[PDB]
Structure 1
Amino acid sequence: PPSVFAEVPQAQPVLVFKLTADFREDPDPRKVNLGVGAYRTDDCHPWVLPVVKKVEQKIANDNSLNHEYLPILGLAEFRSCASRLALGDDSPALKEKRVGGVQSLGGAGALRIGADFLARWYNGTNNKNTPVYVSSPTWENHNAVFSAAGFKDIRSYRYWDAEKRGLDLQGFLNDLENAPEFSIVVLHACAHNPTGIDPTPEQWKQIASVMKHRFLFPFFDSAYQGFASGNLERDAWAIRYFVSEGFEFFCAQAFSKNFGLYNERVGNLTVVGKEPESILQVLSQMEKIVRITWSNPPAQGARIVASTLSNPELFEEWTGNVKTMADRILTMRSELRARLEALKTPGTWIHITDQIGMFSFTGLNPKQVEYLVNEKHIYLLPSGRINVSGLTTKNLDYVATSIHEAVTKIQ
């Protein structure tokens, strides 16, 4: 008889994977991959943070450690350190013991645990109808996680304006003013994915004001703290502002980019509440959620991050390491913009340097992108998104020339 697997179709490849596979295959020597999902150096190589290598040696040599189960909520030192990183050591919320943390399987895991919690205990009990607002566009995992958690009404807020190449603040605010009271708003804390443009601190004040007045629930996604600007405070400004304004909120934290721990899946869900007592109840339910789903947590990534952030000296060394990545990206943005302007490229290019983080919406249209991929062998997404760390001292001129040709030959 036939295999019970005989009619299983070949799954369609996924564009982020296929783009890199196409790059790999390409025999053209000019090829550039601007579609890598991780930081690369000026020589196109992965980068292990020096402080991570040092900490891994310490862990391996620590004979006190065992491999027994962590608490269900995770390694206590990791959770406490991760929360301290977002909020700041002198946060009123930390002083007043109205913070919790839950270790998660990366930032996506933290978003899932939070979503599952909201679907059970927020805005009523077992209320899957609370609207969830995500940016337009956004990281696909925002929509997917909340869908998977059972939320039935996932909505967009206006965010990217392709004409202006920048933030539609008025549309964003308008969409928040029309949000039903108690709707959940998923906010990118800094380094907006996929566009790279963030609200400025004054714009964050306006967003906060509308959220406050309509009792909207902030759910921050903080995937790039420190990695975006090289300055941890700055990168957490909106988060810390929301605390100071009296918000209760969740904040999903990821440590893949800012520790380079892509293959360790280290995340934390920070919870900020009005009062200490109900935080303990919240964590009692998040224990059940973790157990009932996932069940973890794996230790090694968490141990790396805890051992680093808990140690003032390693923490400083790490901030240096992270800043070196951030600074290389910032430099590449500046260099690309300067080269495009020197070529008299049509359009404005301030967006290249107004944006922050590893990803940039270059503002190219899909046909312009198609010219880059197919004629110039520069691999990026049809939205115009590039990984800015794919830019090197060696390829900048080729990329800038190629963009110039795209904008002047196409459309």
Structure 2
Amino acid sequence: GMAPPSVFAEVPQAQPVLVFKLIADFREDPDPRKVNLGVGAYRTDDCQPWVLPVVRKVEQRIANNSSLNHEYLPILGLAEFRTCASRLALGDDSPALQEKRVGGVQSLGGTGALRIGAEFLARWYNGTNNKDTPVYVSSPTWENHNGVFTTAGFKDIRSYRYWDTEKRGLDLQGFLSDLENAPEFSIFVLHACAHNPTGTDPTPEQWKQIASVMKRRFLFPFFDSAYQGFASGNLEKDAWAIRYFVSEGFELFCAQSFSKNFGLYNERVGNLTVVAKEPDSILRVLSQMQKIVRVTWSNPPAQGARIVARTLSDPELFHEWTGNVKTMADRILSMRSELRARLEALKTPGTWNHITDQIGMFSFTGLNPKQVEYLINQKHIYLLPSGRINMCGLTTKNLDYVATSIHEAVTKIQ
């Protein structure tokens, strides 16, 4: 019988993502000692997701409000959310805010913010529809950075030296050198704080050196701020770099995610903050951003944004939230401290100060792939081949086991 083939007959099966497999194997591992350090979200000491008390509270107040409806939000999003989000990253006293040269676009998480910004830059930045401008990402960086910029059309994606495998810290010299040799107007994707996946960030003094080169070579700063407050527990400190760049007079984009700091992962709340030199540019830029949004998602969802704006606008809720965030930051700080302490007490060969120097949920342990392989196959400890672990996978109950296993992997495997 005649039968032409499907129009999807030659569509290949996309390669699977390592981590998605990792999570499956772990789930099937029957060993009661198994540990998951490959998780990508906050977890309590008893390995449970955690909905912020303040969030549960706000949801109840929203549910009980009969005045709300489901009519479309503006293309750019909930006005109150956008204002509060930018104010959070920039500070109430930001000169950019006082000078009315800030704009905000509600987006689908930090990912959506990054996509809209890249789409904009690929059409109106450094000329019209210039897909040739080099885009620089850290080496290594969150896998989706390359993906978002490549999909936006950018053809020249480069990397700047960041992690130093030997020193187990920041390769400032290599980074500086890459900045120096970057063509004028090149775009640099910078992690505001809590670098993903290394956990290593420049110190404020090092940020000053970075800013100095970007300043004179007209390098564009595209900040990715996915962990404000959640990183160190202090909202202000976590946004220092962004604010420093504003004070130094840069124009910039800042992709904000509220997934981790509000634990709203699945409500996709993000905001793209734009900082321009003159107020008039903001209207023109936002008008073009409206066009991009329109053909992507049309207009943004309301639930998450409503929660965040209510929280950030009511002093009582805001103060409660800052406490909920410190709680998260504090647990992570504890796990780092406790882990370093055990490794040192075990007299584990090598330096381990990077474990407490690092900031945030993610950490580049410095273990090689054979040591990681050992930890998985032998000790039932799941992590990525890169040595990256999520501190949230550690608990007061599994800290002893993890530390001794690592000590083992470091002493028996080469």
TM-score range, shorter chain: over 0.9
Match of residue 178 from structure 1:
181
With over 3 angstroms needed to count, the CA separation of the structure-2 counterparts of 1:102 and 1:396, relative to structure 1, is same
- CA offsets, 1:29-48, max 9 Å, x none? 11000011100000000100
Which consecutive segments of 4 or more residues in structure 1 shift more than 4 A? Answer: 1-12
1:188 alignment counterpart: 191
Distance 1:179 1:299 in 2: 40
- Deviation for aligned residue 1:13: 3.1
User: Are 1:256 and 2:259 an aligned pair?
Assistant: yes
Instruction: State the Cα distance separating 1:7 from its structure 2 match.
Output: 7.0
Q: CA deviation at 1:293?
A: 2.1
Instruction: Tell me which moved more, 25-34 or 7-16.
Output: 7-16
Residue 283 to residue 402, structure 1, CA distance change in 2 (3 Å): same
| Residue 283 of structure 2: aligned partner | 280
Once residues 7 and 283 of structure 1 are traced to their aligned partners in structure 2, the CA distance between those partners, rounded to angstroms, is 41
Cα deviation for residue 345 of structure 1 reads: 0.1
Are the structure 2 counterparts of residues 397 and 296 from structure 1 closer, same or farther at C-alpha, using a change threshold of 3 Å?
Answer: same
CA distance in 2, matches of 1:243, 1:91: 8
Shift of 1:294: 2.6
| C-alpha displacement of 1:254 | 0.3
Across the aligned residues of Structure 1 and Structure 2, the Cα RMSD in angstroms comes to: 1.2
The Cα of 1:61 is off from its aligned counterpart by: 1.2
1:293 corresponds to: 296
Task: Quote the Cα distance in structure 2 between the aligned partners of 1:301 and 1:160.
Answer: 34
Deviations 1:88-135 (A, max 9, x none): 011111111100000001101000000011011111111111110100
Distance in 2, matches of 1:352 and 1:53, equals 33
1:203-261 alpha-carbon deviations (Å, 9 max, x no partner): 00000000001010000000000000000000000000001000100000001100001
In 2, the alpha carbon distance for the partners of 1:277 and 1:9 equals 48
Q: TM-score, normalised by structure 1?
A: 0.98
- CA spacing shift, 1:6–1:404, aligned 2, 3 Å: same
Partner of 2:321: 318
| Counterpart Cα distance in 1 of 2:329 and 2:355 | 15
Please report how far the alpha carbon of residue 14 of structure 1 lies from its aligned counterpart in structure 2 after TM superposition: 1.6
Q: In 2, Cα distance between the equivalents of 1:72 and 1:364?
A: 46
Helix, strand or coil for the counterpart of 1:103? strand
- Residues 357-396 of structure 1 deviation map (CA, whole Å, 9 limit, x = unaligned): 0000001000000010010000000100001010000000
Give 1:273 deviation, angstroms: 0.6
Q: Does 1:385 align with 2:378?
A: no
* Aligned CA distance change for structure 1 residues 373 and 7 (closer, same or farther; 3 Å): same
CA distance in 1, matches of 2:249, 2:5: 63
Task: Give the secondary-structure state (helix, strand or coil) at the position aligned to 1:325.
Answer: helix
Q: Deviations over 1:49-71 (max 9, x none)?
A: 00000000111111111100000
Specify the alignment match of 2:340 in structure 1: 337
SS at match of 2:385: coil
Aligned in 2, Cα 1:27/1:11: closer, same or farther, shift over 3 Å? farther
1:290 to partner: Cα distance: 0.4
Q: Deviations over 1:62-84 (max 9, x none)?
A: 11111000000000011000000
Distance 1:272 1:4, change over 3 A: closer
Measured after TM superposition, the shift of residue 4 of structure 1 is 6.3
Q: 1 CA distance for matches of 2:120 and 2:226?
A: 20
Residues 165-192 of structure 1: CA distance to partner in whole angstroms, max 9, x if unpaired?
A: 1100010110000000000000000000
Question: Distance in 1 between the 2:143 and 2:130 partners?
Answer: 23
Tell me whether 4-13 or 368-377 shows the greater mean CA deviation.
Answer: 4-13
Further displaced range: 216-225 or 5-14: 5-14
Q: CA deviation at 1:140?
A: 1.1
Instruction: Tell me the CA shift for residue 17 of structure 1.
Output: 1.1
In structure 1, list runs of 5 or more residues that go unmatched: none
SS in 1 for 2:160: strand
Distance in structure 1 (CA, Å) of the matches to 2:63 and 2:203 = 43
The structural deviation recorded for 1:5 is 6.2
* Structure 2: distance between partners of 1:128 and 1:11: 26
User: 1:47 matched to which residue of 2?
Assistant: 50
Distance 1:176 1:56, change over 3 A: same
Query: Pairwise mapping of residues 356-395 of structure 1 onto structure 2 (< 5 A)?
Result: 356-395=359-398
SS of residue matched to 2:222: strand
| 1:10 shift after superposition | 5.3
- Residue 25 (structure 1) aligns with: 28
Residue 295 of structure 1 deviates from its aligned partner by: 1.8
C-alpha separation in 2, matches of 1:33 and 1:374: 13
Which residue pairs with 1:12 in the alignment? Answer: 15
With over 3 angstroms needed to count, the CA separation of the structure-2 counterparts of 1:210 and 1:10, relative to structure 1, is closer
SS class of match (2:62)? helix
Q: How many angstroms does 1:402 deviate by?
A: 0.4
Report the CA distance between 1:289 and its aligned residue. 0.8
Q: Secondary structure at the match of 1:74?
A: coil
C-alpha spacing 1:185/1:35, structure 2 compared with 1 (3 Å): same
Taking a change above 3 Å as real, the CA distance of residues 394 and 99 of structure 1, as seen in their structure-2 partners, is same
CA–CA distance in structure 1, aligned partners of residues 292 and 12 of structure 2:
34
Q: Distance in 1 between matches of 2:315 and 2:222?
A: 29
Q: 1:300, 1:134 → 2: CA distance?
A: 32
Deviations 1:245-294 (A, max 9, x none): 00100000001100001111110000001111111100010001100223
Distance in 1 of aligned mates of 2:242 and 2:216: 18
CA shift at 1:296, angstroms? 2.5
Q: Residues 12, 119 of structure 1: CA spacing in aligned structure 2 closer, same or farther, 3 A cutoff?
A: closer
Instruction: Report the counterpart of residue 112 of structure 1 in structure 2.
Output: 115
Select between 57-66 and 86-95 the one with higher mean Cα deviation: 57-66
Q: 1:174 to 1:11 in 2, by over 3 A?
A: closer
1:312 Cα offset (Å): 1.4
Q: Any unmatched runs of 5+ in structure 2? A: none
State how far apart, in whole Å, the 2-side matches of 1:12 and 1:136 are: 22
Partners of 1:151 and 1:8 in 2: CA distance: 24
Of 120, 124, 129, the match for 2:127: 124
Are residues 60 and 179 of structure 1, via their aligned partners in 2, closer, same or farther at CA, if it must alter by over 3 Å? same
Q: CA deviation at 1:15?
A: 1.1
